[PDB]
Design a protein around this ligand. Structure first.
Ligand SMILES: C/C(=C\COP(=O)(O)OP(=O)(O)O)CCC[C@H](C)COC(=O)C(NN)C(F)(F)F
Ligand SMILES: [Mg+2]
Ligand SMILES: [Zn+2]
Lengths: 403, 315
């Protein structure tokens, strides 16, 4: 009918196992049967399909979580700036404002997470780490007040980044920790936003990231590893920041990411022959605007003037029909429980799937009710484009720390 | 003595006699908390005592045993992992007993990053990779696609030059599940770091094996991606027989994978001044339309982009 996933021909998109069953095909077929039950529910209950993003339910879940969480969140006790970022960004995508008292309480809490030697830890007094450092800078930039910007100790942040920098161009996640493509992205994101990029800080980084691109076209966590959506987003987004996207084979990357959209489910898988997951709605689909920007900079004349290079409609349908928890919050797939990480990324991916932009051209695709339209998100930083401009302009008033 | 965190006779640290001397340190979440976790009594108890020993930098046997509980409660707490490593060295703890402990916790939480990083540190300290391949194979027996297990495996093999039996292990896992992409990745990892793919006998053996796998499971994307990956290097148009050999599977073993591969061969031919340029172009444009409208409509935007791109370049 007007929904791609509910068309009679969509049944032809079901897995073809060639009468050769393995763990992979069995697990895929289970997911497809579960998703087919969701797609068919309207037909079986004799109701007209209505695609509604449950804003008020999502809002209640988020406004509560911003202040208090149950012991189910003990596993995230070393990820508190991530909880700030995931919740503040989901509220920003839902066009929900931050009361000045909340903005101040977030600032003060992130101050407690900040290490005297630069960077942020996963909680008050915890050692600094690049992942909560990235989340804390993003959250402070979503708030975007003078107080939030002033929280960041830029001189110690630069010192911290230098302490993690490796001779091969890579970055440690933390002192005595490990290297992976996420660390290059976390470093590039915080360093560009706060205007602390020195001439040698990212020396060799583009080259190290390019060594993580493999035979599949995507990017692995470290050289030799299987291509994965999370690392591929981190690798390409870091290269966009550094203006070094050309270090990658962009065409093998484009073919790899587009191949990750599931013909049946409509959502994206993280790697070849694995399962669909709502969080890849951002990690994987977010690569399409980055590739569009990169190819356009090379003056590619064949690029679309209205759509990203993925099925924007089928992705919105997967998120709206399969990823919403009735109680509020979003999830990986039907049967999984809600969490703030999936809420953040399902909504981030929904925004990307709704909003196309390229120079003068602006085209929206809003599946379901018009109230489903989210605030746009910046494909590099995954914070509002206005927050990116505001933070960059603010920090550019400051000189790069001289050391 | 190890009083297990799940033992029926486990006692909170605040009720333990050997801990009476120290005041637990509460977490400073500020006066107006945000993302405040309402910790269970057991969690808050261990963490308030962990904070006390950390703040005073107590490098004791009791602080060492306490990090085990703090890790069990939240294995993602890297501050705890750091202090545990300080204590392993300061206290001169037996690192083989620590290897027994890391084996047990990885078995329980095989997707946690910190546990795998700790195991790598122990292997580095001991300069002993002898239990590695067998330990990883046991994790891969439970989840054959565990990303950290494959990453630790590649680190062990590369760092200690343990290449010799890896292709055989790859062959075994491919027999179990030919669709396991982590294993096709391991195949490429081993070959590229041993013989390389420039050796014509190696390349021929690899393409033949892959084409046999494609015949058995035509809709298995991993084998198709592997065939493309090992030949795209030098360029698909460098192998003239491949096109007709895939066209010879058009009626029997067809899929959007075979059709897409045909477009890939055509793209390379057009970039390498092939004979019958306009004939190759129209064939490629026809397939891009079949893919966009019928056989691979989820990728309609990609296939339309490819069509336009090919027209723009080879008109
Ligand atoms: C090894 C792995 C997943 C396999 O996990 P599993 O096997 O269970 O999943 P699948 O492969 O789907 O079956 C982790 C890589 C992907 C993450 C989403 C990376 O995260 C980020 O990009 C960032 N942050 N938090 C940031 F950039 F912000 F730092
Ligand atoms: Mg760590
Ligand atoms: Zn997910």
């Amino acid at each position: 009918e007007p929904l791609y996933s509910l068309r009679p021909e969509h049944a032809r998109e079901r897995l073809q196992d060639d009468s050769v069953e393995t763990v992979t095909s069995i697990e895929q077929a289970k997911v497809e049967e579960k998703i087919q039950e969701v797609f068919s529910s309207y037909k079986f209950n004799h109701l007209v399909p209505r695609l509604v993003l449950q804003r008020e339910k999502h809002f209640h879940y988020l406004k509560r979580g911003l202040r208090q969480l149950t012991d189910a969140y003990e596993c995230l006790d070393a990820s508190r700036p991530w909880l700030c970022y995931w919740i503040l960004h989901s509220l920003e995508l839902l066009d929900e404002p931050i009361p000045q008292i909340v903005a101040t309480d977030v600032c003060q809490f992130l101050e407690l997470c900040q290490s005297p030697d630069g960077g942020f830890g996963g909680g008050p007094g915890q050692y600094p780490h690049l992942a909560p450092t990235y989340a804390a800078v993003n959250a402070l930039c979503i708030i975007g007040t003078e107080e939030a910007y002033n929280v960041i100790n830029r001189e110690k942040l630069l010192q911290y980044l230098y302490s993690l920098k490796q001779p091969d161009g890579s970055f440690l996640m933390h002192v005595g920790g490990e290297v992976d493509v996420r660390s290059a992205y976390c470093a590039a994101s915080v360093a560009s936003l706060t205007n602390i990029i020195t001439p040698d800080l990212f020396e060799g980084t583009a080259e190290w990231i390019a060594r993580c691109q493999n035979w599949e076209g995507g990017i692995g966590g470290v050289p030799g590893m299987e291509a994965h959506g999370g690392y591929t987003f981190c690798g390409l987004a870091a290269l966009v920041i550094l203006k070094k996207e050309r270090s990658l084979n962009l065409k093998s990357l484009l073919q790899w990411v587009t191949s990750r959209q599931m013909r049946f489910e409509g959502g994206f898988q993280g790697r070849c022959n694995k399962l669909v997951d709502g969080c890849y709605s951002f990690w994987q689909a977010g690569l399409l605007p980055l590739l569009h920007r990169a190819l356009h900079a090379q003056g590619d004349p064949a690029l679309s003037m209205s759509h990203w290079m993925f099925h924007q409609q089928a992705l919105q349908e997967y998120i709206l029909m399969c990823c919403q928890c009735p109680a509020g919050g979003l999830l990986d797939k039907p049967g999984k429980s809600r969490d703030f990480y999936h809420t953040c990324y399902c909504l981030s991916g929904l925004s990307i799937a709704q909003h196309f932009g390229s120079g003068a051209m602006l085209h929206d695709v809003v599946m379901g009710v018009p109230e489903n339209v989210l605030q746009p998100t910046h494909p590099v930083y995954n914070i509002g484009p206005d927050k990116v401009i505001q933070a960059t302009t603010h920090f550019l008033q400051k000189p790069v720390p001289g050391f | 003595g190890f009083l297990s965190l799940d033992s029926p006779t486990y006692v909170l640290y605040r009720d333990r006699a050997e801990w009476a001397d120290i005041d637990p340190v509460p977490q400073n979440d500020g006066p107006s908390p945000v993302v405040q976790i309402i910790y269970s009594e057991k969690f808050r108890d261990v963490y308030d005592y962990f904070r006390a020993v950390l703040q005073r930098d107590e490098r004791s046997e009791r602080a060492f045993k306490l990090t085990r509980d703090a890790i069990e409660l939240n294995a993602a707490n890297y501050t705890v992992w750091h202090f545990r490593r300080v204590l392993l060295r300061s206290l001169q703890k037996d690192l083989q007993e620590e290897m027994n402990y890391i084996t047990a916790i990885i078995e329980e939480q095989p997707k946690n990053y910190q546990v795998w990083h700790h195991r790598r540190v122990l292997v580095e300290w001991l300069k002993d990779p002898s239990q590695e391949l067998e330990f990883i194979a046991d994790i891969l027996n439970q989840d054959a696609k565990n990303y950290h297990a494959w990453q630790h495996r590649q680190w062990v093999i590369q760092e200690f030059r343990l290449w010799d039996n890896e292709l055989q292990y790859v062959d075994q896992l491919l027999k179990e599940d030919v669709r396991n992409n982590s294993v096709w990745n391991q195949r490429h990892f081993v070959i590229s770091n041993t013989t390389g793919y420039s050796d014509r006998a190696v390349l021929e053996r690899e393409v033949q094996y892959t084409l046999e796998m494609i015949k058995l499971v035509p809709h298995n994307e991993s084998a198709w991606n592997y065939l493309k990956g090992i030949l795209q290097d030098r360029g698909l148009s460098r192998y003239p027989n491949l096109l007709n050999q895939l066209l010879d599977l058009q009626p029997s073993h067809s899929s959007p994978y075979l059709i897409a591969f045909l477009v890939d061969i055509y793209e390379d031919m057009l970039e390498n001044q092939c004979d019958n340029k306009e004939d190759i172009l129209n064939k490629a444009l026809e397939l891009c339309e079949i893919l966009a409208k019928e056989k691979d409509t989820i990728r309609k935007e990609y296939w339309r982009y490819i069509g336009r791109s090919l027209q723009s370049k080879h008109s």
